[PDB]
Amino acid sequence: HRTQLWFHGRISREESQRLIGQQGLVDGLFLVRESQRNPQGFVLSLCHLQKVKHYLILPSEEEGRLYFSMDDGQTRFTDLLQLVEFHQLNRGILPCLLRHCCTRVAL
């Protein structure tokens, strides 16, 4: 997930809202970040209807095998790449599809 264009590391929630607005409040614009409130969790920050929504991605364990989920284990993924790739085609609990990635700035 670290080698993906949509992953921004350990940026803040407001940092995520500033980047999305800087690129344009388009439906489907998203990024994934490491959560600062939960060091073990991640967040899918998604723009929908010109509002940035945040979806907590939590780690869990089932018999020595770790998975990530946004719905308490109803839908499970091995890594964040599988979660993003799935929701680029299927809405799930999201209000829209992951359409455009919020890119990291070119330093």
Binding site: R37, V43, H54, Y55, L56, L58, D71, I93
Partner: peptide
């Protein structure tokens, strides 16, 4: 649901 987050 998780406080602070739009999960449902």
């Amino acid at each position: 649901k998780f406080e602070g987050f739009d999960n449902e």
